[PDB]
Amino acid sequence: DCAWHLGELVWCT
Amino acid sequence: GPSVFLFPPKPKDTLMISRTPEVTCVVVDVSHEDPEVKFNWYVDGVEVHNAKTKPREEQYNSTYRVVSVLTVLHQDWLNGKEYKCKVSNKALPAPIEKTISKAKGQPREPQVYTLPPSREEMTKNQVSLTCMVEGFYPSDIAVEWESNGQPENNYKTTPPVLDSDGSFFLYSKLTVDKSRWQQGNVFSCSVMHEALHNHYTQKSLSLS
Amino acid sequence: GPSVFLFPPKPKDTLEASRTPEVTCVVVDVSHEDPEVKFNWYVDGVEVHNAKTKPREEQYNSTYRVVSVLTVLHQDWLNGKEYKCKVSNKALPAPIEKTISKAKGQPREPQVYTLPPSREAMTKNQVGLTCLVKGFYPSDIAVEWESNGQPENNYKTTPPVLDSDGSFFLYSKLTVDKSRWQQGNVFSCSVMHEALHNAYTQKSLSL
Numbered sequence A: 001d002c003a004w005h006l007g008e009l010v011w012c013t
Numbered sequence B: 001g002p003s004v005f006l007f008p009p010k011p012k013d014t015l016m017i018s019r020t021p022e023v024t025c026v027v028v029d030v031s032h033e034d035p036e037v038k039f040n041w042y043v044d045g046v047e048v049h050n051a052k053t054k055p056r057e058e059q060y061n062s063t064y065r066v067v068s069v070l071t072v073l074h075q076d077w078l079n080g081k082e083y084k085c086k087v088s089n090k091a092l093p094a095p096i097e098k099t100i101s102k103a104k105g106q107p108r109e110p111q112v113y114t115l116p117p118s119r120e121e122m123t124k125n126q127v128s129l130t131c132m133v134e135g136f137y138p139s140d141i142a143v144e145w146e147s148n149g150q151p152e153n154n155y156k157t158t159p160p161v162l163d164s165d166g167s168f169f170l171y172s173k174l175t176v177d178k179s180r181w182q183q184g185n186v187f188s189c190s191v192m193h194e195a196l197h198n199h200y201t202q203k204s205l206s207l208s
Numbered sequence C: 001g002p003s004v005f006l007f008p009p010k011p012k013d014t015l016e017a018s019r020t021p022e023v024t025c026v027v028v029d030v031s032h033e034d035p036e037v038k039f040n041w042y043v044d045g046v047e048v049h050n051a052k053t054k055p056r057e058e059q060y061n062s063t064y065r066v067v068s069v070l071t072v073l074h075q076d077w078l079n080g081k082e083y084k085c086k087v088s089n090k091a092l093p094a095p096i097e098k099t100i101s102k103a104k105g106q107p108r109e110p111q112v113y114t115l116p117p118s119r120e121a122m123t124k125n126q127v128g129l130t131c132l133v134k135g136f137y138p139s140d141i142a143v144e145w146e147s148n149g150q151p152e153n154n155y156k157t158t159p160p161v162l163d164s165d166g167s168f169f170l171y172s173k174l175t176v177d178k179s180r181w182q183q184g185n186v187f188s189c190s191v192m193h194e195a196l197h198n199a200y201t202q203k204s205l206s207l
């Protein structure tokens, strides 16, 4: 899955 | 003669795949007689040639500032690769070599807790929302705040402090108008750190 | 030539009446050819003659460390008096002068708030109890913990951080065995700062 921060991609596994 | 300072990338840049982390090799006290500076970059002893020199900058104290920037790969930085900048200048008897890498040691996941304002603070015009971040290694971290999908800027965060168990902790304090707290508005603490799932967690706080 | 660093008193020394705060004039890189250092002390421009010189100390790098200590009066320090250490040595073309004093600006009383561990924090063997100290100026402060009249020493405290209103804040974190917290024991965050009543306050926390 993916992490987002204020509509910005942080990281996905 | 010239002095060299080699800086790591920003934690946010290393932890966000949508950002571009870079290491910076700064040379100061470069004379007007010999402004020519040569850089050699090495990634784990292996020379690389994709570095970029910034516009030369006059300092008006008789010296130039000369900067070389190297893009680094996210995983390379996080896997602990060493970056070496070798600086040569006519005023230097020998080349100056500096080295940076991520701090050594098994990464530890930050435990993130939000603490509401104390009852005793409820007389004030504004209240303190606390984000407590502990048990993290290495100390590279970013903390930010949000509400209603919008960033909240009225916060200050402590430097990381080395804890007795060898991890680090810090606190972030967001200051909000008391009414916003009383009205049930949800606030959120965002933490970016390598040992977190997807480099990220978000913890929420509202009046219960 | 040699280098001079002038140090303020420890905050706990200025804040406890029975303690003896002092300013410390450290001189480093003093040569073997001229180990003699003349000190002159000035309190608000007025020369004082009651400083003490510490034992001379050879490092290793073929340098001497020479230290002068001047005891400071509690009221003097609090009134913001300026302490000047002038250092003369033969390896110096000019006498080096340094000043320190308490940071200037109106003192502001800290607000001390104790914050209980989150529910999420209860899964582990030990828990962090939090003391938020904020709204204080100057940044000179001492924070300790206690329980049932006994000092609790298993805490770390952040440095003071400058806040957006120009005061300072910090957090201190005391780590206790979870069972002690579960069993209702009271823990106390104690804060020393000049703008507090009696330069002391204590706030309690329990489950």
Ligand SMILES: *[C@@H]1O[C@H](CO[C@@H]2O[C@@H](C)[C@@H](O)[C@@H](O)[C@@H]2O)[C@@H](O[C@@H]2O[C@H](CO)[C@@H](O[C@@H]3O[C@H](CO[C@H]4O[C@H](CO)[C@@H](O)[C@H](O)[C@@H]4O[C@@H]4O[C@H](CO)[C@@H](O[C@@H]5O[C@H](CO)[C@H](O)[C@H](O)[C@H]5O)[C@H](O)[C@H]4NC(C)=O)[C@@H](O)[C@H](O[C@H]4O[C@H](CO)[C@@H](O)[C@H](O)[C@@H]4O)[C@@H]3O)[C@H](O)[C@H]2NC(C)=O)[C@H](O)[C@H]1NC(C)=O
Binding pocket: B003, B005, B007, B008, B009, B010, B013, B021, B022, B023, B024, B026, B028, B029, B059, B061, B063, B065
């Ligand atoms: C002539 O003037 C120049 C310029 O000086 C400036 O102008 C004058 C007029 C005054 O106003 C000064 O106050 C100005 O600085 C003088 O050059 C200075 O020399 C100093 C050494 O003599 C040197 O000190 C060392 O600084 C290190 C930290 O530097 C940081 O932080 C300071 C602010 O605190 C900042 O000014 C520096 O530029 C530098 O800032 C970082 O820049 C890096 C590189 O760009 C950034 O990292 C990158 O950021 C980008 C995005 O921006 C991106 O994310 C990249 O991925 C990332 O890599 C980073 O963001 C910046 N950080 C911050 C916090 O802002 C200290 O660590 C170092 O201390 C160590 O060494 C000491 C020994 O000297 C030890 O005592 C100590 O224990 C430490 O081990 C030094 O103190 C100054 O940095 C330098 N100034 C500049 C601007 O470069 C020059 O000396 C003078 N010559 C003469 C003859 O007088």
Ligand SMILES: *[C@@H]1O[C@H](CO[C@@H]2O[C@@H](C)[C@@H](O)[C@@H](O)[C@@H]2O)[C@@H](O[C@@H]2O[C@H](CO)[C@@H](O[C@@H]3O[C@H](CO[C@H]4O[C@H](CO)[C@@H](O)[C@H](O)[C@@H]4O[C@@H]4O[C@H](CO)[C@@H](O[C@@H]5O[C@H](CO)[C@H](O)[C@H](O)[C@H]5O)[C@H](O)[C@H]4NC(C)=O)[C@@H](O)[C@H](O[C@H]4O[C@H](CO)[C@@H](O)[C@H](O)[C@@H]4O)[C@@H]3O)[C@H](O)[C@H]2NC(C)=O)[C@H](O)[C@H]1NC(C)=O
Binding pocket: C003, C005, C007, C008, C009, C010, C013, C021, C022, C023, C024, C026, C028, C029, C059, C060, C061, C063, C065
């Ligand atoms: C030969 O060696 C000597 C000694 O070096 C040591 O031994 C060798 C073998 C090595 O192992 C070294 O690592 C050892 O340090 C060298 O002497 C050193 O010169 C340094 C460079 O000039 C100098 O750096 C400056 O340090 C300032 C802070 O000093 C603090 O902290 C350091 C490190 O933590 C510590 O080493 C110092 O002793 C000093 O500690 C404080 O002492 C004061 C005064 O006693 C304490 O205050 C008192 O506390 C008591 C409690 O008992 C009481 O309450 C009193 O009331 C109170 O006054 C205080 O608590 C101590 N604090 C701490 C944290 O420990 C820096 O501020 C300064 O940085 C700034 O300098 C410039 C400013 O313009 C800027 O460039 C820069 O940006 C900074 O702002 C300096 O870096 C070292 O202090 C000094 N070391 C010692 C031990 O004295 C010598 O240089 C070397 N020569 C050669 C040719 O190689």
